[PDB]
């Protein structure tokens, strides 16, 4: 239950690392 | 009733297009990064 609780937070950090690659790229390049 | 028979097929199939094409264009970039890692 502990490690299962950690894994989703890890992939959430990986999600924010992708939204930063979305919103600060679409205005720059186009 | 051709407006309510044949044209009623135009409005439906497009909804399947609008998300299965999104599934492909997601999944193929997901392939493409890994293939660049391979080569």
């Amino acid at each position: 239950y502990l490690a299962s609780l950690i894994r989703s937070v890890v992939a959430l950090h990986n999600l924010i690392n992708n939204k930063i690659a979305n919103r600060d790229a679409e205005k720059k390049e186009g | 009733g051709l407006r309510q028979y044949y044209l009623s097929k135009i409005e439906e199939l497009q909804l399947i297009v609008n998300d299965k094409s999104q599934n492909l264009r997601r999944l193929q970039a997901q392939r493409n990064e890994l293939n660049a890692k391979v080569r």
């Binding site: 239950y1 894994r7 992708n18 | 493409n32």
Partner: protein
């Protein structure tokens, strides 16, 4: 006239200055880019329509001297709006009536003059086939009539304007709705006019014809197009059925339209609440506390007093029916000083183990609970107060007489204090024995619930669910993969130069 002649002339041009830039941009964008171009890839005029509702909800208040809105209707109703060579004069006509307001005196629309401001689907080549133009050009005067309401003999003017919008609405229901978002764009305009329709034409007069007409509007849904008609036509169906007592709760159980497939976070979020009160009045068995909770958590950020104070009440009404109660006094922002005191004063009695303290609540605020109408749910809490009691005393004491628990619970009768305990062993709750001959109720010490297979289920409920939110953080994640333009291997010129350098290494 100086105080009016200096503070009245600036509120005509600056609302004209912003309304030539927001819904004249919707006039140039949703007529020429939804009726003639694809708006599914670019549907920003629906959220811009949300902006041109929420701005005008609090834009107009006054009876409009200086013709600051009263002169807009002789301007904004003379609209052909066919094509750019026909609207190139109309762009001048947004200016030519400013000389009518400023230079001369216009028609002061004060509760009487709405009749010559509505009979223009005919004047100067106006039509109805461009219903992105004629439904938006219906709503753009249909809103500010009814935004302040003006219940003094304006009900028939609003009514006839709703009749012309019903001509646009029957043309929407019958005539050429394929692949234009004619139905889709005017399910939002139809949906928004159902509430001005439903705050003049509902509690004044005769909603039960909007029942049959609304089942016709629901009937024309779900066949031709599968969006925007499945969503609003069910809360707009529900909102007086909850205030009625018809059987339309089990029909909402067996309905196919229960999922309108991502209904825009606003009708969908409240929909789970409206079906939450359904199983409230039909006996919450902890089924809908997650849909009340979900109905709370899918809210935006505006205010709480309209619905959120009532889901903050009714959401734990149904948990007071269970036996669990969180503390309601949380983010004391508007809701937790104004709208709790009878209702938190209710659960203060429930969290105790007193019997007639509940009556000391329910004589003090029986009418406030009938102000909202939760009173028929409040009236059955005595069962859960007394199960709270028997769990409290059966959990606290071990060898306690039946001739003590009735007096501590002020039951005034031991002879059924055998019987409340009896059904407390019948229904589950407390397990152990009663010495009815002696009087004492014995209770065993049940420890090591650890080995007993409950916390593995408390695990297993959340193991798979935390894997589910992991999987959602996987699936809501692979759209920013895009613009991955070129993974060039090395080069062409540097590859030929490396082949030339290796050729020099082979020659050397």
């Amino acid at each position: 006239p100086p105080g009016g002649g200096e503070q009245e002339p600036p509120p005509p041009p600056a609302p004209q200055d912003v309304e030539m830039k927001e819904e004249a941009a919707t006039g140039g964008g949703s007529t020429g880019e939804a009726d003639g171009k694809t708006a599914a890839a670019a549907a920003e005029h629906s959220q811009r329509e949300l902006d041109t509702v929420t701005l005008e909800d609090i834009k107009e208040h006054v009876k409009q001297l200086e013709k600051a809105v009263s002169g807009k209707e002789p301007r904004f109703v003379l609209r052909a709006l066919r094509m750019l060579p026909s609207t190139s004069r109309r762009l001048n006509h947004y200016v030519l009536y400013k000389a009518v307001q400023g230079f001369f005196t216009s028609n002061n629309a004060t509760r009487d003059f709405l009749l010559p401001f509505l009979e223009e689907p005919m004047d100067t080549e106006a039509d109805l086939q461009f219903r992105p133009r004629t439904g938006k050009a219906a709503s753009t005067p249909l809103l500010p009539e009814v935004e302040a309401y003006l219940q003094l003999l304006v009900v028939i003017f609003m009514m006839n304007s709703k009749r012309y919008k019903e001509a646009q609405k029957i043309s929407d229901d019958l005539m050429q709705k394929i692949s234009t978002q004619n139905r889709r764009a005017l399910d939002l305009v139809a949906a928004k006019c159902y509430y001005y329709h439903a705050r003049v034409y509902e509690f004044l007069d005769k909603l039960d014809v909007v029942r049959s007409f609304l089942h016709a509007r629901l009937r024309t849904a779900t066949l031709r197009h599968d969006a925007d008609g499945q969503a609003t036509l069910l809360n707009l169906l529900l909102r007086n059925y909850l205030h009625y007592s018809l059987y339309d709760q089990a029909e909402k159980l067996v309905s196919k339209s229960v999922f309108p497939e991502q209904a825009n976070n606003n009708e969908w979020a409240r929909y789970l609440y409206y079906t939450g009160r359904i199983k409230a009045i039909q006996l919450e068995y902890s089924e809908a506390r997650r849909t009340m909770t979900n109905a709370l958590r899918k809210a935006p950020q505006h205010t709480a007093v309209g619905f959120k104070q009532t889901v903050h009440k009714l959401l734990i009404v149904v948990e007071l029916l269970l036996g669990e109660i969180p503390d309601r006094l949380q983010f004391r922002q508007p809701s937790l000083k104004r709208s709790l005191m009878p209702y938190f004063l209710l659960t203060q009695a429930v969290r105790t183990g007193n019997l007639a303290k509940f009556n000391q609540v329910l004589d003090q605020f029986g009418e406030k609970f009938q102000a909202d109408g939760t009173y028929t749910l409040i009236i059955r809490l005595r069962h859960n107060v007394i199960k709270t009691g028997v769990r409290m005393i059966s959990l606290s004491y071990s060898r306690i007489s039946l001739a003590d628990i009735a007096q501590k619970l002020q039951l005034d009768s031991p002879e059924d204090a055998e019987f409340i305990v009896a059904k407390a062993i019948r229904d589950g709750v407390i397990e152990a024995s009663i010495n009815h001959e002696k009087g004492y109720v014995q209770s065993k010490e049940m420890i090591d619930i650890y080995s007993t297979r409950e916390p593995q289920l408390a695990f297993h409920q959340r193991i798979s669910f935390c894997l589910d939110i992991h999987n959602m953080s996987v699936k809501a994640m692979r759209f920013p993969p895009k613009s991955y333009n070129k993974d060039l291997e090395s080069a062409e010129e540097r590859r030929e130069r490396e082949q030339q350098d290796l050729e020099f290494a082979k020659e050397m």
